[PDB]
Design an enzyme around this catalytic site. Structure first.
Site, PDB file in Angstrom:
ATOM      1  N   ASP A   1      16.180   7.178  -3.722  1.00 44.66           N
ATOM      2  CA  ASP A   1      15.897   5.745  -3.605  1.00 44.66           C
ATOM      3  C   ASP A   1      14.561   5.426  -4.283  1.00 44.66           C
ATOM      4  O   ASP A   1      13.710   4.721  -3.736  1.00 44.66           O
ATOM      5  CB  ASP A   1      15.920   5.306  -2.135  1.00 44.66           C
ATOM      6  CG  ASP A   1      16.194   3.819  -1.951  1.00 44.66           C
ATOM      7  OD1 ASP A   1      16.764   3.177  -2.859  1.00 44.66           O
ATOM      8  OD2 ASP A   1      15.830   3.284  -0.878  1.00 44.66           O
TER       9      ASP A   1
ATOM     10  N   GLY B   1      13.332  -6.687   7.881  1.00 45.68           N
ATOM     11  CA  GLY B   1      14.638  -6.586   7.267  1.00 45.68           C
ATOM     12  C   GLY B   1      15.621  -6.027   8.271  1.00 45.68           C
ATOM     13  O   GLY B   1      15.366  -6.041   9.477  1.00 45.68           O
TER      14      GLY B   1
ATOM     15  N   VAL C   1       7.665  -3.870  10.000  1.00 44.99           N
ATOM     16  CA  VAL C   1       6.524  -3.016   9.722  1.00 44.99           C
ATOM     17  C   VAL C   1       5.276  -3.829   9.996  1.00 44.99           C
ATOM     18  O   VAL C   1       5.131  -4.938   9.475  1.00 44.99           O
ATOM     19  CB  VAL C   1       6.516  -2.489   8.274  1.00 44.99           C
ATOM     20  CG1 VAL C   1       5.342  -1.546   8.081  1.00 44.99           C
ATOM     21  CG2 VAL C   1       7.829  -1.785   7.956  1.00 44.99           C
TER      22      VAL C   1
ATOM     23  N   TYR D   1      16.331  -2.984   8.753  1.00 45.96           N
ATOM     24  CA  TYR D   1      15.752  -1.806   9.393  1.00 45.96           C
ATOM     25  C   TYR D   1      14.899  -2.165  10.608  1.00 45.96           C
ATOM     26  O   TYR D   1      14.719  -1.334  11.500  1.00 45.96           O
ATOM     27  CB  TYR D   1      14.895  -1.038   8.391  1.00 45.96           C
ATOM     28  CG  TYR D   1      13.737  -1.859   7.868  1.00 45.96           C
ATOM     29  CD1 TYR D   1      13.841  -2.577   6.683  1.00 45.96           C
ATOM     30  CD2 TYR D   1      12.530  -1.917   8.561  1.00 45.96           C
ATOM     31  CE1 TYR D   1      12.768  -3.337   6.210  1.00 45.96           C
ATOM     32  CE2 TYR D   1      11.464  -2.679   8.102  1.00 45.96           C
ATOM     33  CZ  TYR D   1      11.588  -3.382   6.930  1.00 45.96           C
ATOM     34  OH  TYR D   1      10.511  -4.111   6.476  1.00 45.96           O
TER      35      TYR D   1
ATOM     36  N   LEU E   1       3.846  -6.563   7.971  1.00 46.94           N
ATOM     37  CA  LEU E   1       3.928  -6.241   6.546  1.00 46.94           C
ATOM     38  C   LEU E   1       5.292  -6.527   5.956  1.00 46.94           C
ATOM     39  O   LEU E   1       5.398  -6.845   4.769  1.00 46.94           O
ATOM     40  CB  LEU E   1       3.585  -4.771   6.321  1.00 46.94           C
ATOM     41  CG  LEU E   1       2.134  -4.492   6.692  1.00 46.94           C
ATOM     42  CD1 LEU E   1       1.810  -3.049   6.426  1.00 46.94           C
ATOM     43  CD2 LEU E   1       1.207  -5.451   5.896  1.00 46.94           C
ATOM     44  N   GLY E   2       6.343  -6.382   6.743  1.00 49.26           N
ATOM     45  CA  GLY E   2       7.666  -6.633   6.219  1.00 49.26           C
ATOM     46  C   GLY E   2       8.651  -6.665   7.359  1.00 49.26           C
ATOM     47  O   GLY E   2       8.312  -6.372   8.508  1.00 49.26           O
TER      48      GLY E   2
ATOM     49  N   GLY F   1      14.174   7.661   3.855  1.00 50.73           N
ATOM     50  CA  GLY F   1      15.368   7.524   4.680  1.00 50.73           C
ATOM     51  C   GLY F   1      16.640   8.047   4.042  1.00 50.73           C
ATOM     52  O   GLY F   1      17.547   8.492   4.751  1.00 50.73           O
TER      53      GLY F   1
HETATM   54  C1  LIG Z   1       7.085  -3.363   3.751  1.00 51.93           C
HETATM   55  C2  LIG Z   1       6.638  -1.956   4.104  1.00 51.93           C
HETATM   56  C3  LIG Z   1       5.288  -1.540   4.037  1.00 51.93           C
HETATM   57  C4  LIG Z   1       4.943  -0.229   4.392  1.00 51.93           C
HETATM   58  C5  LIG Z   1       3.762   0.581   4.470  1.00 51.93           C
HETATM   59  C6  LIG Z   1       2.368   0.264   4.184  1.00 51.93           C
HETATM   60  N1  LIG Z   1       1.986  -0.995   3.699  1.00 51.93           N
HETATM   61  O1  LIG Z   1       1.502   1.133   4.322  1.00 51.93           O
HETATM   62  C7  LIG Z   1       4.160   1.854   4.904  1.00 51.93           C
HETATM   63  N2  LIG Z   1       3.379   2.975   5.131  1.00 51.93           N
HETATM   64  N3  LIG Z   1       5.529   1.904   5.084  1.00 51.93           N
HETATM   65  C8  LIG Z   1       6.249   3.036   5.556  1.00 51.93           C
HETATM   66  C9  LIG Z   1       6.360   3.164   6.945  1.00 51.93           C
HETATM   67  C10 LIG Z   1       5.694   2.164   7.885  1.00 51.93           C
HETATM   68  C11 LIG Z   1       7.116   4.223   7.477  1.00 51.93           C
HETATM   69  C12 LIG Z   1       7.754   5.151   6.650  1.00 51.93           C
HETATM   70  C13 LIG Z   1       7.632   5.008   5.274  1.00 51.93           C
HETATM   71  O2  LIG Z   1       8.220   5.901   4.415  1.00 51.93           O
HETATM   72  C14 LIG Z   1       6.878   3.940   4.699  1.00 51.93           C
HETATM   73  C15 LIG Z   1       6.775   3.827   3.225  1.00 51.93           C
HETATM   74  C16 LIG Z   1       6.030   0.615   4.779  1.00 51.93           C
HETATM   75  N4  LIG Z   1       7.317   0.243   4.832  1.00 51.93           N
HETATM   76  C17 LIG Z   1       7.610  -1.007   4.500  1.00 51.93           C
HETATM   77  C18 LIG Z   1       9.085  -1.373   4.572  1.00 51.93           C
END
Ligand SMILES: Cc1cc2c(C(N)=O)c(N)n(-c3c(C)ccc(O)c3C)c2nc1C
EC number: 2.7.11.1
Length: 281
Positions: A153, A39, A44, A41, A36-37, A173
């Site tokens: 944020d 960076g 995902v 960090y 999904l992404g 975070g």
């Molecule tokens: C690009 C991206 C997609 C998702 C995502 C999802 N498409 O559903 C999800 N749930 N997160 C997520 C995750 C994986 C952990 C903690 C958190 O606060 C969040 C918002 C994501 N993060 C990122 C950077």
């Protein structure tokens, strides 16, 4: 090497996994459907679980813990996410764990971010869609603020779209818990979305309201926010830029003025905006 659960409820380490095999727990208990992404960090992935067959997202850090401070900063995200808890407009965390100096966060699967949706739309969002996202993000913020939590944020990249025009606030975070009877530490935020009083070190829930206001301004008017300079100051004087905001309705413009109030003493709270006629649906 073995995976250990991460949680801040006091639990030390609360099937289908064989520790003897060299493959990591992430590889053994999941199938990576897509990335999904990525960076600084980490990454995902979209995944499907084998305990209950549901769909989830997993975030993993890039490289192993440098030291105890690096480990403590990364794990604090799990702690902040747990303080939020379960709420319909907040991304829900299932579980988190560490293995090999790598942190993993498993959450529910959500749709594209508000940022991705706006890039694909290639224009100002239709106002009707904007009201729904504003309402749901205000509800998420009202939930956080009622517990003394500041997100710090709020921006399109951290708001995740769901079916039927709903959305969820994510990425805790940078979350901090307010407390002059307790302790805290603050990380650097995105200057484009920063409330003006943060420059003078005054932190409070009102900073999130200002960031949401800039967020709505950006997506509803397709406007790029400045990092600094005269443009940055122009947005923090209490006057909207006439050129971009022309198409906005009177109700949205008036709500924006209240959220963008430079004085945090006078800025509307989330609970208050949600009681206004347009938002009280
Ligand atoms: C690009 C991206 C997609 C998702 C995502 C999802 N498409 O559903 C999800 N749930 N997160 C997520 C995750 C994986 C952990 C903690 C958190 O606060 C969040 C918002 C994501 N993060 C990122 C950077």
């Amino acid at each position: 090497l073995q995976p250990r659960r991460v949680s801040f409820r006091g639990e030390a380490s609360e099937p289908g996994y064989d520790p003897s095999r060299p493959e990591s727990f992430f590889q053994q208990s999941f199938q990576r459907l897509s990335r999904l992404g990525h960076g600084s960090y980490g990454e995902v992935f979209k995944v499907r679980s084998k305990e209950d067959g549901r769909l989830y997202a997993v975030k993993r850090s890039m490289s192993p813990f440098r030291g105890p401070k690096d480990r403590a900063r990364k794990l604090a995200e799990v702690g902040s996410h747990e303080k939020v808890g379960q709420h319909p407009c907040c991304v829900r965390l299932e579980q988190a764990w560490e293995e090999g100096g790598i942190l993993y966060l498993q959450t529910e699967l959500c749709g594209p971010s508000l940022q991705q949706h706006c890039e694909a739309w290639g224009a100002s969002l239709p106002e009707a869609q904007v009201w729904g996202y504003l309402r749901d993000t205000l509800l998420a913020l009202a939930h956080l603020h009622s517990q003394g939590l500041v997100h710090l944020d709020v921006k399109p990249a951290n708001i995740f779209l769901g079916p039927r025009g709903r959305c969820k606030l994510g990425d805790f975070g940078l979350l901090v818990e307010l407390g002059t009877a307790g302790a805290g530490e603050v990380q650097e935020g995105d200057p484009r979305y920063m409330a003006p009083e943060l420059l003078q070190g005054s932190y409070g829930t009102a900073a999130d309201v200002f960031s949401l206001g800039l967020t709505i301004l950006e997506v509803a008017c397709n406007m790029e926010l400045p990092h600094g300079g005269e443009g940055w100051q122009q947005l923090r004087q209490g006057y909207l830029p006439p050129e971009f905001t022309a198409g906005l309705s009177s109700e949205l413009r008036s709500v924006l003025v209240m959220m963008l109030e430079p004085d945090p003493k006078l800025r509307a709270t989330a609970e208050a905006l949600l009681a206004l006629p347009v938002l009280r649906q």
